[PDB]
Design a binder for this molecule. Structure first.
Ligand SMILES: [Mg+2]
Ligand SMILES: [Mg+2]
Ligand SMILES: [Mg+2]
Ligand SMILES: [Mg+2]
Ligand SMILES: [Mg+2]
Ligand SMILES: [Mg+2]
Ligand SMILES: [Mg+2]
Ligand SMILES: [Mg+2]
Ligand SMILES: [Mg+2]
Ligand SMILES: [Mg+2]
Ligand SMILES: [Mg+2]
Ligand SMILES: [Mg+2]
Ligand SMILES: [Mg+2]
Ligand SMILES: [Mg+2]
Ligand SMILES: [Mg+2]
Ligand SMILES: [Mg+2]
Ligand SMILES: [Mg+2]
Ligand SMILES: [Mg+2]
Ligand SMILES: [Mg+2]
Ligand SMILES: [Mg+2]
Ligand SMILES: [Mg+2]
Ligand SMILES: [Mg+2]
Ligand SMILES: [Mg+2]
Ligand SMILES: [Mg+2]
Ligand SMILES: [Mg+2]
Ligand SMILES: [Mg+2]
Ligand SMILES: [Mg+2]
Ligand SMILES: [Mg+2]
Ligand SMILES: [Mg+2]
Ligand SMILES: [Mg+2]
Ligand SMILES: [Mg+2]
Ligand SMILES: [Mg+2]
Ligand SMILES: [Mg+2]
Ligand SMILES: [Mg+2]
Ligand SMILES: [Mg+2]
Ligand SMILES: [Mg+2]
Ligand SMILES: [Mg+2]
Ligand SMILES: [Mg+2]
Ligand SMILES: [Mg+2]
Ligand SMILES: [Mg+2]
Ligand SMILES: [Mg+2]
Ligand SMILES: [Mg+2]
Ligand SMILES: [Mg+2]
Ligand SMILES: [Mg+2]
Ligand SMILES: [Mg+2]
Ligand SMILES: [Mg+2]
Ligand SMILES: [Mg+2]
Ligand SMILES: [Mg+2]
Ligand SMILES: [Mg+2]
Ligand SMILES: [Mg+2]
Ligand SMILES: [Mg+2]
Ligand SMILES: [Mg+2]
Ligand SMILES: [Mg+2]
Ligand SMILES: [Mg+2]
Ligand SMILES: [Mg+2]
Ligand SMILES: [Mg+2]
Ligand SMILES: [Mg+2]
Ligand SMILES: [Mg+2]
Ligand SMILES: [Mg+2]
Ligand SMILES: [Mg+2]
Ligand SMILES: [Mg+2]
Ligand SMILES: [Mg+2]
Ligand SMILES: [Mg+2]
Ligand SMILES: [Mg+2]
Ligand SMILES: [Mg+2]
Ligand SMILES: [Mg+2]
Ligand SMILES: [Mg+2]
Ligand SMILES: [Mg+2]
Ligand SMILES: [Mg+2]
Ligand SMILES: [Mg+2]
Ligand SMILES: [Mg+2]
Ligand SMILES: [Mg+2]
Ligand SMILES: [Mg+2]
Ligand SMILES: [Mg+2]
Ligand SMILES: [Mg+2]
Ligand SMILES: [Mg+2]
Ligand SMILES: [Mg+2]
Ligand SMILES: [Mg+2]
Ligand SMILES: [Mg+2]
Ligand SMILES: [Mg+2]
Ligand SMILES: [Mg+2]
Ligand SMILES: [Mg+2]
Ligand SMILES: [Mg+2]
Ligand SMILES: [Mg+2]
Ligand SMILES: [Mg+2]
Ligand SMILES: [Mg+2]
Ligand SMILES: [Mg+2]
Ligand SMILES: [Mg+2]
Ligand SMILES: [Mg+2]
Ligand SMILES: [Mg+2]
Ligand SMILES: [Mg+2]
Ligand SMILES: [Mg+2]
Ligand SMILES: [Mg+2]
Ligand SMILES: [Mg+2]
Ligand SMILES: [Mg+2]
Lengths: 188, 124, 260, 155
RNA sequence: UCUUAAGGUAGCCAAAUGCCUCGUCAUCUAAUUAGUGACGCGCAUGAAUGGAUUAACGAGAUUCCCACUGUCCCUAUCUAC
RNA sequence: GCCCGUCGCUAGUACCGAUUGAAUGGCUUAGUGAGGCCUCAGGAUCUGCUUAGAGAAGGGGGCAACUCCAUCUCAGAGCGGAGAAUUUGGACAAACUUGGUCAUUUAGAGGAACUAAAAGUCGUAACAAGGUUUCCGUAGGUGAACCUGCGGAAGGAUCAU
RNA sequence: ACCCACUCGGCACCUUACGAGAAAUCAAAGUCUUUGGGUUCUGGGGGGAGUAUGGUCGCAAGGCUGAAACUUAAAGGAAUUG
RNA sequence: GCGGUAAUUCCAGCUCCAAUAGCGUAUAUUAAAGUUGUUGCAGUUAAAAAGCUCGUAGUUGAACUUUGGGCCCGGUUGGCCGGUCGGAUUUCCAACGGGGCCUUUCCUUCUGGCUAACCUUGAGUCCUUGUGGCUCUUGGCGAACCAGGACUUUUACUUUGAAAAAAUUAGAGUGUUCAAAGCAGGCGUAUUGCUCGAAUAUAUUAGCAUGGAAUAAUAGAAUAGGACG
RNA sequence: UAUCUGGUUGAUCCUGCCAGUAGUCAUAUGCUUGUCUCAAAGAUUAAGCCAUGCAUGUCUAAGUAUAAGCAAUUUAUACAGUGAAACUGCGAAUGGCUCAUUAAAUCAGUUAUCGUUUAUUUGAUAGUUCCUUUACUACAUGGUAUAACUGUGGUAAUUCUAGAGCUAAUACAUGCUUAAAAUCUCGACCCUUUGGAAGAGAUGUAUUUAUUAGAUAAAAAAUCAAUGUCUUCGGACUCUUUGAUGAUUCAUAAUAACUUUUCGAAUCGCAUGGCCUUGUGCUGGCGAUGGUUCAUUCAAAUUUCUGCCCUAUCAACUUUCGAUGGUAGGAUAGUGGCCUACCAUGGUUUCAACGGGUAACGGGGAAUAAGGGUUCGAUUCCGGAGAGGGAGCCUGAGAAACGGCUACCA
């Protein structure tokens, strides 16, 4: 089917190239997953030499980590909001790598308020010790905190769902988050 | 798909087709040693020419050159071994000399006659 | 061309087997094993073309299927098995022990060794990497992997091996002035000590060599196999001790030992 | 080539896996990664002091230089972050026993750590396929400008 | 060889100019008194009585093709008056 | 003596040419588009996991109370799986119809070359100051070679007042 | 202005011929089988033919570029004697 | 070029020639061909200098920059002896090459690792009246190359070398009975094995690697924005 | 192994070609043909067309035997010899043939993978699998559904197969398990210190993400935040651990998670032994097949530098509908305009681009012997390509396969 050779397609001089040999299986390519949101559904591709690839088509949850916080939580993927390659992916909420999605927050709230005893936005014994040892360390960040009030967090898919079957990302933070904040609203 | 069973031919054929001198001399050679062809002469003169050639190529090298020494000697001890090259003249400038008769004299054809035993190259 | 090549045309076969041009159209294609196709010796060529212990290949399979041959310790029942350099061929019957080791013309020569020296071998380490679970490992030219070796062992050193068990019992570092056996090139089969290594970052280090006749020659690092100290090797070398004689030298040697 | 903006793409331009924790107050904002290509090619200060991204940089990018190392003279600097160099050489024709001037134009990626101009002689390292045609990366500028300021005005 | 003031040159042709004539040869067709290309002892072509050639233009005369269709095979039905 | 051209005969070769001529091959627009593959669905049938009913089983250990595991059997209820025909949308895309392009070929009435060619018919152009010196370029003219005007060259018939 | 000597750069002639050529002849047409200073252009038997075809230039006449099938044992040069 | 009535070319008989288990023919190609000419052609009159001058690509391009002298080291042929039980090495000797030195003389460069080599000497001596000779550690060689830092004008040419399939070619050995071949084979106790082989060469252009520094290019310091510290 | 001869004239020297001459791993044809050895052979034209037969199958003590098979004999009443059929496994992706396409393609010599896949071979490599964690979960081993077979049938016709009834596994689908220790988060309590704690959970491998370690270019200091070990209670910290490459974000490891959860043996053959608390207890010999990851081997796929015949009566070419580059993604085993989205205007060319021709597969090589050359290579080895022409794809480690399927064309 698809062929990733270079035997079609003109030479840098612009010459036109002959049809030497027929299509080979090792130059193959396949169609995009064009993976979507909601209700897990995954098909396994049989690749070169045994070997499985997991094509994800529809996904409702992924595993998103909060890097500056050291932890990784599984949440719901609420929707696609930004995509640098193509806007039909944002409009179709199509999950690919580098897609900017909005997750769920509530597992990151449940972790933070139970780890810092501080609550976002707006009695046990050892627990009070830990909650005192932590601080000068609980300042969060204006942009990650105001996201929490909305119950949804900007994150950036970093896995390849049509490849791995996983939709795994990382929470937008600091410099990146500023950039895509500008982009988000400076088109909103 | 098998190894090529290699071959080559063993004679060459005179450039000038009709040279009375060369036909006279050749004929005398057939009637002297009892040969049936001019090919029997051509073949031997072919051997002589490949020898003379190697002899010239060796002679152009430097004296005491490793190849000239190794191959030149082997050729000389080879020609002595059969009886074409005399013991006195045993240093490849006589192999550059030489001639066809020296080769012809060494055939079992000519030897069986030479020490009697036949008393006619043809009876030989 | 669609998959692995299972045949071998006699002519494409490596020349250091000394197979006759005619008398067939194929040669034994060395099975996959410890040694590279082009630098191996298949058990059929050894049991029959070197050792004359058979006439047919059919008899080489008869010999082998009775576990007579055992290679480097284990039995080995593969007709075309890729035996190679430093390997120990061992016939229990006949009480014979061979080590595969190069000529000086660059071939594998029939070398008979003691019943006792035939229980260890040399192996040039080709890589030493920190394996899984932090267990370092060292792997030698003949495809042996050996966990937990000495820290000081690095690539290009050589290694004495148990054969009985796998363990490494000794190792000789790659230092200027150590007995060297050439494993490839036109200086294949020679032996001689090392002068010094040319570096060349990015590819192909040159190994200057001198043998025990004050004759020098260079080869690529890839082709150098350390086997001990000047004089003192570590295994029994073959006659001629890898010195290489000119065509003249060899002509006089063979045509001096002539008095019937 | 590049210059200005840095962050001038639809995607955020970042070095992969080089985290700068916002909790940790830093007086350098962004944490930068670099290396040296080897073969003694100094990773110039413009690559370490720089702020650009270029994942095809041999010093600040994700490409390894290995294989050939060649030199040519820069004849085109119109593609963004890549150039084309000419490689002349004489070809030997036996029958006539003389030579004839030939040439080939190699396309080569050029990191914004180098300010390259047409005419400069450049030293170029082989590396994995970067583009449809680019198989090389500029690793050293053996020239300067060719006495450009020495063509200035009158007294 | 008679004869004239001179005896048709360059061109062009069965031409809107050729009797014979539906000229002969080729081409287009299943088949062509049609069309075109040739030929020319041209009843009786021919040089401002202008000869020949011409892009463009034509409700001009003619031939063929594509498309098109009730022109036809072969007729039928409907609206208004 | 040699020799030029028209004109005439036989044979060959190639050229021009109405036929908007023909044929093979390689690309290729537009239109139509099989098939497998991927994907939205489909659900012939055929099971699962869970939940409850009724009839028997085996005991976790007691005098009545009390109680686990696996297995088979029929009203009845939730949440998923396999999966045929069928089928939505795609990339891949043979192939058909109609055109165009490039390459290689090729029929043709007729026209007009050249050759075999030396012979023929009409002249005498060249070779002798060839009987008008010859030749070049150009231009016109004439059965034919050729003649004439203008400018050259000597390879002239003059190396010379 | 003229005469004599010289030296540059000219247009030429004279005699030579060490040397060159097939020769006529040539101070280059010489220093070439004892074969190499640098560089541009053209030719490869005679006809067919500067024809056919394409491209290009021109108002035109024509210019530049420019084949092949076929045919043919000579065509040709310089000199000698008639 | 022969054949038109005595045909040395036809048709035959005779004889004769050449090659010979082979010989003729056709088509192609190679040699002859210095008629493709790099080596190596020709162009006044035989084929062939563009009517002329400009001129870009291309090819080509004057001379000059460490030359000269002095000292040491060790090789490989050749002579005159041979000492010797065909080859041997020292001195006497030339010849021809290689390496390092000092002459104003970068060898990239710091910072140690290492040292082989003498300016050393610490003793004296085997032994020819002594600089003939090396063991031998305590003041005094850099480069021989490790490895780390810091940098470097670019090429062409040549040398050597690595990396280098087999068969092919060249070629050594071996008596396939000869030969084309093949890679065998050859020795005895031929009743219980012994053994030589299966070479060497070419392998270029490009890439790699080392030596050379003539010949050719290239870069440098003039609005000093030069060099060393 | 450096050679020439015939033909222009009356004669001459030239130029010049024609003709002679010699060889061809160079074909054809003609006449003639006895012996030994060696032995090429439908390439050329038509990669035109094909009758019939054959050319790919395969079993070890060691996956599956209730053949209603054969043998019986020698112990075998679950099985046990031998063994059709069938399942299962592997192989059919090698070999052989042709030279049509192909002109920067292939090929070659030389590189590259710090850019990937790899059955097999060879060497390594696995105590962790259950679960609110005393009235337990088949481990002395959990589930069916099928072939062959029996039997009923269909069609003119094929290696067509339908309905019915059985039964296996190393086929299909499930699913238990094993030591010690340490390190992490939780933390019931108690008590104010500088602070400590019973006991609860988590930690195989693989997968996806994010994060950290992976030092070293010669030496020293202060402070903020957390927080390690040793008190001779103001304090100190002393020994302090480091793999590879020219070069990495490398090998490897640590934290937080993730997963329609990858592997972690429900298999086979030979022997049958030790050891008592006599349970047929608990142990145990040799090797087969498998199994995850790593290496190795056989490979593969791309890939750097340089080299191709004729042609200007081909000078401009390349971006319709990727042409040259940037970014991001998708796709791939993986790099890459391989593809898509956005963005730019680039790329090649008289040092001949682009186009056309080739009666063009490329190389090792062949013929011709002064040398320099010229010509040739369909064809015994290597590489490539194809299987009437195209495309598509299943299986698989490996094919875009054709002695595989699918569709179109012929
Ligand atoms: Mg993906
Ligand atoms: Mg095999
Ligand atoms: Mg076997
Ligand atoms: Mg870039
Ligand atoms: Mg650009
Ligand atoms: Mg680039
Ligand atoms: Mg008139
Ligand atoms: Mg007129
Ligand atoms: Mg008229
Ligand atoms: Mg008329
Ligand atoms: Mg009419
Ligand atoms: Mg009319
Ligand atoms: Mg017709
Ligand atoms: Mg009509
Ligand atoms: Mg008509
Ligand atoms: Mg008409
Ligand atoms: Mg009439
Ligand atoms: Mg008039
Ligand atoms: Mg009129
Ligand atoms: Mg007009
Ligand atoms: Mg009109
Ligand atoms: Mg009309
Ligand atoms: Mg009406
Ligand atoms: Mg005719
Ligand atoms: Mg028509
Ligand atoms: Mg036709
Ligand atoms: Mg379709
Ligand atoms: Mg799709
Ligand atoms: Mg025609
Ligand atoms: Mg025609
Ligand atoms: Mg006619
Ligand atoms: Mg003509
Ligand atoms: Mg004539
Ligand atoms: Mg006249
Ligand atoms: Mg006259
Ligand atoms: Mg006169
Ligand atoms: Mg006249
Ligand atoms: Mg003339
Ligand atoms: Mg002279
Ligand atoms: Mg004279
Ligand atoms: Mg000619
Ligand atoms: Mg024209
Ligand atoms: Mg005008
Ligand atoms: Mg014209
Ligand atoms: Mg012309
Ligand atoms: Mg013309
Ligand atoms: Mg007669
Ligand atoms: Mg005759
Ligand atoms: Mg006769
Ligand atoms: Mg002959
Ligand atoms: Mg010659
Ligand atoms: Mg010629
Ligand atoms: Mg030369
Ligand atoms: Mg010569
Ligand atoms: Mg000539
Ligand atoms: Mg002339
Ligand atoms: Mg002139
Ligand atoms: Mg011009
Ligand atoms: Mg000069
Ligand atoms: Mg000097
Ligand atoms: Mg010297
Ligand atoms: Mg060399
Ligand atoms: Mg002649
Ligand atoms: Mg004649
Ligand atoms: Mg004449
Ligand atoms: Mg005559
Ligand atoms: Mg006369
Ligand atoms: Mg002749
Ligand atoms: Mg001839
Ligand atoms: Mg014989
Ligand atoms: Mg036939
Ligand atoms: Mg054929
Ligand atoms: Mg054939
Ligand atoms: Mg035909
Ligand atoms: Mg049975
Ligand atoms: Mg099977
Ligand atoms: Mg094959
Ligand atoms: Mg079932
Ligand atoms: Mg380290
Ligand atoms: Mg027992
Ligand atoms: Mg296994
Ligand atoms: Mg891109
Ligand atoms: Mg990719
Ligand atoms: Mg553009
Ligand atoms: Mg442009
Ligand atoms: Mg050209
Ligand atoms: Mg072809
Ligand atoms: Mg060819
Ligand atoms: Mg070939
Ligand atoms: Mg062919
Ligand atoms: Mg390859
Ligand atoms: Mg066929
Ligand atoms: Mg196929
Ligand atoms: Mg096949
Ligand atoms: Mg077709």
């Amino acid at each position: 089917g698809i062929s990733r050779d270079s035997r079609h397609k003109r030479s840098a001089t612009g010459a036109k190239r002959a049809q030497f040999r027929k299509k080979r299986k090792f130059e193959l390519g396949r169609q995009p997953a064009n993976t979507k949101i909601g209700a897990k559904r995954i098909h396994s591709v049989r690749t070169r030499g045994g070997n499985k690839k997991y094509r994800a088509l529809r996904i409702e949850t992924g595993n998103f980590s909060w890097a500056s916080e050291g932890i990784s939580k599984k949440t719901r993927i609420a929707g696609v909001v930004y995509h640098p390659s193509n806007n039909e992916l944002v409009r179709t909420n199509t999950l690919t790598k580098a897609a900017i999605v909005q997750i769920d927050a509530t597992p990151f709230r449940q972790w933070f308020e139970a780890h810092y005893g501080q609550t976002l936005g707006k009695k046990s014994k050892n627990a009070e010790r830990k909650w005192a040892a932590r601080a000068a360390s609980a300042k969060i960040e204006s942009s990650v905190e105001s996201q929490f009030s909305a119950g949804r967090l900007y994150a950036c898919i970093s896995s390849r769902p049509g490849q791995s079957g996983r939709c795994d990302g990382y929470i937008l933070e600091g410099e990146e988050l500023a950039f895509y904040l500008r982009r988000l609203t400076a088109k909103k | 798909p098998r190894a090529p069973r290699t071959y080559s031919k063993t004679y060459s054929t005179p450039k000038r087709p009709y040279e009375s001198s060369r036909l006279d001399a050749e004929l005398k050679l057939a009637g002297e040693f009892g040969l049936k062809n001019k090919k029997e002469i051509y073949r031997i003169s072919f051997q002589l020419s490949k020898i003379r050639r190697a002899a010239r190529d060796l002679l152009t090298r430097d004296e005491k050159d490793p190849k000239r020494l190794f191959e030149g000697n082997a050729l000389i001890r080879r020609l002595v071994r059969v009886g074409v090259l005399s013991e006195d003249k045993k240093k490849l400038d006589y192999v550059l000399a030489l001639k066809v008769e020296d080769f012809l004299e060494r055939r079992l054809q000519t030897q069986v006659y030479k020490l009697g035993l036949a008393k006619s190259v043809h009876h030989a | 061309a669609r998959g692995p090549k299972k045949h071998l045309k006699r002519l494409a076969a490596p020349h250091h087997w000394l197979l006759d041009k005619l008398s067939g159209c194929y040669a034994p294609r060395p099975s996959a094993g410890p040694h590279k196709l082009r630098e191996s010796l298949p058990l059929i060529v050894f049991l029959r073309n070197r050792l004359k212990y058979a006439l047919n290949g059919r008899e080489v399979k008869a010999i082998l299927m009775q576990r007579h041959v055992k290679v480097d310790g284990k039995v080995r029942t593969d007709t075309t098995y890729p035996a190679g350099f430093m390997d120990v061929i061992t016939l229990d019957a006949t009480n014979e022990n061979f080590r595969l080791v190069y000529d000086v013309k660059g071939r594998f020569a029939v070398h008979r060794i003691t019943d006792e020296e035939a229980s260890y071998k040399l192996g040039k380490v080709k890589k030493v990497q920190l394996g899984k679970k932090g267990v370092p490992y060292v792997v030698t030219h003949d495809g042996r992997t050996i966990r937990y070796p000495d820290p000081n062992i690095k690539v290009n050193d050589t290694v004495k091996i148990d054969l009985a068990s796998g363990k490494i019992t000794d190792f000789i570092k790659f230092d200027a002035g150590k007995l060297v056996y050439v494993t490839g090139g036109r200086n294949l089969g020679r032996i001689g000590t090392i002068v010094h290594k040319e570096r060349h970052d990015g590819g192909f280090d040159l190994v200057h060599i001198k043998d025990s006749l004050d004759n020098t020659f260079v080869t690529r690092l890839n082709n150098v196999f350390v086997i001990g100290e000047q004089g003192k090797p570590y295994i029994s070398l073959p006659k001629g001790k890898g010195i290489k004689l000119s065509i003249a030298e060899e002509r006089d040697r063979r045509r001096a030992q002539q008095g019937l | 080539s590049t210059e200005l903006t840095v962050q001038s793409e639809r995607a955020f331009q970042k070095q992969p896996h080089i985290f700068n924790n916002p909790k940790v107050k830093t007086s350098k904002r962004t944490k930068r990664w670099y290396k040296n290509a080897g073969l003694g090619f100094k990773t110039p200060k413009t690559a370490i002091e720089g702020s650009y991204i270029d994942k095809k940089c041999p010093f600040t990018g994700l490409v390894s230089i290995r294989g050939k190392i060649l030199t040519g003279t820069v004849v085109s600097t119109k593609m963004h972050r890549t150039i084309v160099i000419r490689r002349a050489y004489l070809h030997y024709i036996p029958k006539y026993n003389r030579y004839e001037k030939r040439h080939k134009n190699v396309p080569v990626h050029v990191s914004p750590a180098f300010r390259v101009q047409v005419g400069d002689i450049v030293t170029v390292g082989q590396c994995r396929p970067i583009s449809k045609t680019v198989r090389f990366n500029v690793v050293k500028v053996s020239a300067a400008a060719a006495x450009x300021x020495x063509x200035x005005x009158x007294x």
